[PDB]
Amino acid sequence: KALTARQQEVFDLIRDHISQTGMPPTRAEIAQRLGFRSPNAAEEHLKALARKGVIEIVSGASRGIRLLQEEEEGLPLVGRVAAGEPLLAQQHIEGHYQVDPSLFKPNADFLLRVSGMAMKDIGIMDGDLLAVHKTQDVRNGQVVVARIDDEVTVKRLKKQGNKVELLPENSEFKPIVVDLRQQSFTIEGLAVGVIRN
Amino acid sequence: GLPLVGRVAAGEPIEGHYQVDPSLFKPNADFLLRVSGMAMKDIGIMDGDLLAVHKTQDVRNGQVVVARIDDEVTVKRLKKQGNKVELLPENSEFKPIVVDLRQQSFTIEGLAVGVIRNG
C-alpha cells in the first residue's frame, strides 16, 4: 500500500501478535522484539501506521491498538508453518489469490498447501491447495486442519475421550493418536474444498 | 472468471460462471467442465469436481486430456501410437479405451490443467 520497510515490520508484528494471542502488543513488546532504542521509537512507527490508516490508536488504556481495513479480496495462501508461530503469520503467507470465497460452503477464509498423500482416497493430493473455513466448532467425521505440538496436519476427526484419533484416507497410513493430557492440540479449521493447479 | 460450459465423462454416462483467476493455472484455463464418474480417482479427479481446461490441440502421451469420441466428451490419460489411440483411466476397475483414427471421429478438446472441488 505505502509502508516503509520498517513500518511493515512493525505492522507484521502487530498482526502476528493478534493472530496468536487475540490482542495487540504493547509499545515495550514492539521495541524489545524489533530492537528499538525505546518505547518512544515504537510509538512513532505506530503513529505513522495510524496515519496510513492500517490501524486505529485508542489513546490511553494498554494495548490500545485496532486494525482497520480488514475486509480483503481473494484468499491468502498459507505455505509452510513454523513452530511457535500462528498459522496465519505473515511470514507463512505466500500470496493472495483471486478466488470467490463464497464458492465454498462454509466460506473459505484461507488456502493451505497440503503436504503428503495421507488423504489420497478422498481426492486430496500432495501439493493441493486446501480451502479452509476458520473455526473450532467441528464434529466427528469431518476433515479438519489440526495442530499437534506445532505440527499441522489434515485428517478426519475421531474424538476418543481424553484422546483424539486423526484418521487418514490412505491404506499405507495409520491413525495419529493424540493424548490431550500431554500434548498441545488445537483445531485450526474445517476443510471446505480443494484447488489443484 | 471461468465459464462452466458443460459436463465431461469420466466413467459415467453454459451452466455457470466462476470468479476464479484463470492465471492460477498453467497454461491458463479457458473453461471448466463438470466431471462425472470415478474413472480418474487415482490421481485425485473425483465425481462432481470442476475440471479446469486449456483449449489446445497440442498434447502428448501421459497428459490428462479432454477428448471427444463420436460426440461424447471424456477425460482420460492419452497414449497415442500412429493410428492407435489409447485412452487410459486412473482407476484399476476401468478398462482402457482404444480408438482407431481411420474408423472413428476423434478430436482433442483440451488439456486438463487443474481442479476445483467445492462440494
Describe the structure.
It is classed as hydrolase. The entry lists the keywords LexA SOS repressor, hydrolase. It forms a dimeric assembly. Two copies of one chain form a homodimer. The first copy, chain A, is of the alpha+beta class. Chain A has two domains: 79-197, Umud Fragment, subunit A; 1-69, Winged helix-like DNA-binding domain superfamily/Winged helix DNA-binding domain (Arc Repressor Mutant, subunit A). Chain A is built from three helices and eleven strands, in the order H-H-H-E-E-E-E-E-E-E-E-E-E-E. Chain A has helices at residues 5-21, 27-33, 39-51; strands spanning 55-57, 65-67, 75-78, 93-97, 110-113, 129-133, 143-148, 151-160, 163-167, 176-179, 185-196. The first copy, chain A, has a nine-stranded mixed sheet with strand order 4-3-5-6-11-7-8-9-10, with no helix packed on it. In chain A, strands 1-2 form a two-stranded antiparallel ribbon. Chain A binds chain B through residues 97-100, 103-105, 120, 122-125, 128, 131, 192-197, and chain B through 18-21, 24-26, 41, 43-46, 49, 52, 113-119. Strand 11 (185-196) of chain A pairs antiparallel with strand 9 of chain B, so a sheet runs across the interface.
